[PDB]
Amino acid sequence: SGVIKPDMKIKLKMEGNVNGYAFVIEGEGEGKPYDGTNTINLEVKEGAPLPFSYDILTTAFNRAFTKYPDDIPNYFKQSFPEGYSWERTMTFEDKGIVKVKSDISLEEDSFIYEIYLKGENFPPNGPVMQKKTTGWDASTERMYVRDGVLKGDVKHKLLLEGGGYYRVDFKTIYRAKKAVKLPDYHFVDHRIECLNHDKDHNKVTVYESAVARNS
């Protein structure tokens, strides 16, 4: 078998603060990197109960889990076993901002993520701080090369209870820890879903599907 098996495990820690509220979340899970699916079981270890929408964390909880056709070089799978890091800005239409960074490494058949997240300037009675969001819409991330690394943009939408929407622009820089074959611009279609296991989101399962396709 190769560096990336059809079944891989996940271990992560996120340290973060949102509007001056600190927390630590640990996760373990599994996915099918070639199917482009992954599941993570998350537990709040510090800062329970979280005083904000869990949805601003879930896209931080690994493009190794993306279905890719052979005719698009796979920036992410090529980077292993050394791995890659990413840095992301999420700009919210009400001037909320999240900055998050992650280091993705590999030990045997377990990906390991080290995540740091800072959210600030959320309106205190807005849908994020009042936990009025109901997940992310399906999305398309445009992948493109700038400054010899891979970048992704999403014009994203947070769904609001009552059936409205909240615009969020994602900009991500993905940096392989070694030289890999760079792809031409392409798309990754995402679907991310949350299953909470309790009232306070102390325990949550996140599921994501991701499929790459050509221009």
Check the CA dihedral 55-61-63-66 and report its sign: negative
Closest CA relative to residue 211, chosen from 8, 5, 38:
38
**What is the spatial distance between Cα 60 and Cα 55, in angstroms, rounded to a whole number?**
10
Method: X-ray
Helix (H, G, I), strand (E, B) or coil at 204: strand
* Torsion region of 95: left, alpha or beta (phi above 0 gives left; psi -120 to 50 gives alpha): left
Q: Please name the residues in contact with 181: beta carbons below 8 A apart, sequence gap of 6 or more.
A: 73, 78
Helix (H, G, I), strand (E, B) or coil at 74: coil
**What is the spatial distance between Cα 162 and Cα 181, in angstroms, rounded to a whole number?**
45
**What is the spatial distance between Cα 98 and Cα 120, in angstroms, rounded to a whole number?**
7
**What is the spatial distance between Cα 17 and Cα 49, in angstroms, rounded to a whole number?**
13
Residue owning tokens 């959210």: 119
Q: How crowded is residue 123: how many other Cβ atoms within 10 Å of its Cβ?
A: 14
**What is the spatial distance between Cα 89 and Cα 151, in angstroms, rounded to a whole number?**
12
Domain segments of the chain as ranges: 1-215
**What is the spatial distance between Cα 122 and Cα 129, in angstroms, rounded to a whole number?**
7
